[PDB]
Each structure stands twice: as structure tokens, then as C-alpha cells.
Amino acid sequence: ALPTPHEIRNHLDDYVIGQEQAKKVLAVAVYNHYKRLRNGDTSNGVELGKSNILLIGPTGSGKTLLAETLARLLDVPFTMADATTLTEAGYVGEDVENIIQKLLQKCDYDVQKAQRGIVYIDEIDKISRKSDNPSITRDVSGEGVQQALLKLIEGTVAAVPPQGGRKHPQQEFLQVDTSKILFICGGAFAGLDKVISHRVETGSGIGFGATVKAKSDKASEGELLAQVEPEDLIKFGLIPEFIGRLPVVATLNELSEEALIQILKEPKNALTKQYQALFNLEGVDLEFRDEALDAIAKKAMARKTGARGLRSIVEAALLDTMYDLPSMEDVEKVVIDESVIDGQSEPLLIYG
């Protein structure tokens, strides 16, 4: 039986928090994708279409994490790539067919199962054109990449070299069809909020006769992104033909201080549990007080590092203990509190 969206959402909830809307889109898409593969026979005349996802969210919001948390349960081959590396054909940077090559590695270079795989494309924001470009330079890193992906996303046969090879007149190619291969392009469209802010509150005129009734409101970047439409992406620099390939769009809100605290303990692969297990094997228990978790989140927000910064904060706080704990003896358990975070007091050590 194909896993229902609730089951898929539960797995994402275990590793991801605060992205309920994003999980639903990916969960239903994965469920619908399995149904299409399950309905691969297609006895009925109707031909099931394919819908791609476009994850737009700020950096450090778990866009990449959502993709990594699916490979664990995903039955079909799944891979991750970077759009920045991709370049237009005929240039020294790269080619777009390498994406299929990465997918081929996971499937044991079997095109049959590869056709039913799912693909993820990171950092798609860098491919957008900046503005008012005549194109005389023949931009390769940007517009050129989009033009090549168009046929790939909708579905076209692609010649993929066997391994570690570049396209050439040689016959070392593998015909792979991307019609049934799902694509999830995820990127942090920095500056898109300003475009959305403009259209929503551009206003009309500046003088006495102008209409300034519209009042600019202070809203979070995640809240504003929900009002995004395809017209906004065109101004950002994306080709209209590209958005048509990505009908479904899901936006992720920025993490808050309270969410950071939850991420420290609630996730199954929580950062706190990693250090605890590191100490448990040695034979010394480890415990983190809620007083320290609040301070840890404040430091990350103060430095704007985000969720990634949590690792650095924990490393510094436990640097002294980790160095001395293996050599030391008679340490049954260690207790950490807010006093450890600021550095005024060393972490409390319990003796047995």
C-alpha cells in the first residue's frame, strides 16, 4: 500500500518543524507521484500529467533538509544537485544533463527505474537575470541554464554520458526520458519580497492629488511571500516559460527564537541528542537545562547565524568538558545551564 500523506507528513514532522504548509505539498506530491507510478499501466485513455514544486524560502529554513529527509523513505532513486554549477551547453562550466547523471549513480545506472525517480535542484535563485539585460553578453550562468531546463522538466529524451564524461561526438551516451521524473527546484529568492512589497503597496502619485490611501504594513518575509504570484517572478529575472513548468509553489516561513529552542530537542536527529549520545557511549550521562537552550537560541538570533549556528554555540560551550572528560575519571553526569553559555561558570560536573 502506498503511504498516505499523513504518514509522509509525520516523517517530515519528526525531522522538520515549522514548515507545515511545505510538508503538505511535498507529501501529497510524493503520494500522487506514487499513484502515477502505480497507475503506470494507464489502461484508461487519460494520461496523468506531472506537476513540479518550487520551494521559495529564506536560507536556513530547512529547504535542503526537506529533500534529505525524503531519501530515507523514498523508494524511487533520489538525488540532490546545485543550479549554480549548471551552465549552458557548449561552455566550460557544465551541462544540464549532469543532473540525470547524478540520479543514475543512485539507481545503479538503470534508466528504467531512473525514469520513475525524483530530482531536487538547489540554489535556483542565482540563475535569474538581474535586470534590463540586452543579452549581447550571452549570459551562460543565468538565462542560458533556464532555456536548457525547459525541455528537461516537461520531459524529453536526454543523452547522459556513462560516468565522468563530457558530451562529445562519441557514442558514449545513455538515452534517459525525464517525462516521469519529478523535479523540485528550491532556492532562496533574495529580494523577491521587495518586488512583492512594491506591487502590493506601490502606490500611485506623490502629490496632493495622488492616492496614498494604501498604507505600508510591517509583515514578516514569510508572510509576504505567501502573496507571491507568477508575475512577481518574471520581474525577478525568471523566464515565463520556466514558471509554467513549475505550477505548484510552496513558501517556507523564517524560523523564530521559539522554534530554534524546539529544534534543539524535538527533532529525532536533534543537535542536543548528538552530543548526549557522544557522552553516553563513554559512560557519562549528559543533560541540558532549558535555561541553556533559551540562551543558545538568543546567541544564534543575535548573530543571525540561524539553525546552522547552533552547532558552533554548543561546540564552544562544551569545548572545555569534551577536552577533559575523556582523561577525567569519576564523572557520572554533567549538567549545563545558562551560566555555561555566557562563560561566567564552568559546566557543573557530577561525581559518583
Ligand X SMILES: Nc1ncnc2c1ncn2[C@@H]1O[C@H](COP(=O)(O)OP(=O)(O)O)[C@@H](O)[C@H]1O
Ligand Y SMILES: Nc1ncnc2c1ncn2[C@@H]1O[C@H](COP(=O)(O)OP(=O)(O)OP(O)(O)=S)[C@@H](O)[C@H]1O
C-beta closer to Mg ion: residue 79 or 321: 79
Q: Find the binder of ligand Y among 18, 77, 117, 144 (CB under 6 A).
A: 18
Question: Under a CB-based contact definition with an 8 Å cutoff, are residues 306 and 254 in contact?
Answer: no
313 CB-near residues (< 8 Å, 6+ apart): 296, 299, 300, 341
45 annotated ligand binder: no
The DSSP element (H or E) to which 198 belongs, if any, is helix 192-201
Residue pointed to by grid coordinates 496632493: 208
Contact 226, 253 (CB under 8 A): no
CA distance 52 to 55: 10
Q: Give which of 148, 144, 122, 149 is closest to 133, Cα–Cα.
A: 144
Please tell me whether 169 is known to bind a ligand.
Answer: no
Q: What CA dihedral angle connects 9, 13, 16 and 17, to 10 degrees?
A: 120
SS3 (DSSP) at 153: helix
**Is 62 annotated as a binding-site member?**
yes
281 is in an annotated binding site: no
Binding mask 56-85 for Mg ion (x = CB under 5 A): --------x---------------------
Shorter beta-carbon distance to a copy of itself: residue 43 or 216: 43
User: Is 197 labelled as part of a ligand binding site?
Assistant: no
325 near ligand Y, judged by CB under 6 A = no
Whether the CA torsion 274, 277, 281, 283 is positive or negative: it is positive
- Which x/- pattern over 284-313 shows residues binding ligand Y (rule: CB under 6 A)? -----------------------xx-----
Our CB check for ligand Y shows the closer of 16 and 185 to be 16
Q: How far is the CB of 201 from a copy of itself (least distance, A)?
A: 19
Strands in 53-56's sheet, in edge-to-edge order, are 78-82, 118-122, 182-187, 53-56, 248-251
Residue 111 in contact with ligand Y, rule: CB under 6 A: no
Instruction: For residue 222, state whether it binds ligand Y (rule: CB under 6 A).
Output: no
Within 13 A of 24's CA, how many CA atoms are on the CB side?
9
| Closer residue to ligand X, CB minimum distance, 18 or 161 | 18
Q: Which does 291 bind (CB under 5 to 8 A by kind): a copy of itself, ligand X, Mg ion, none?
A: none
Judged by DSSP in three states, 157 sits in: strand
Residues 234-263 that bind Mg ion (CB under 5 A): none
CB-nearer residue toward ligand Y: 117 or 267: 267
64 labeled part of a ligand binding site: yes
18 in a labelled binding site? no
Binding residues: 58-65
Binding residues for ATP: 58-65
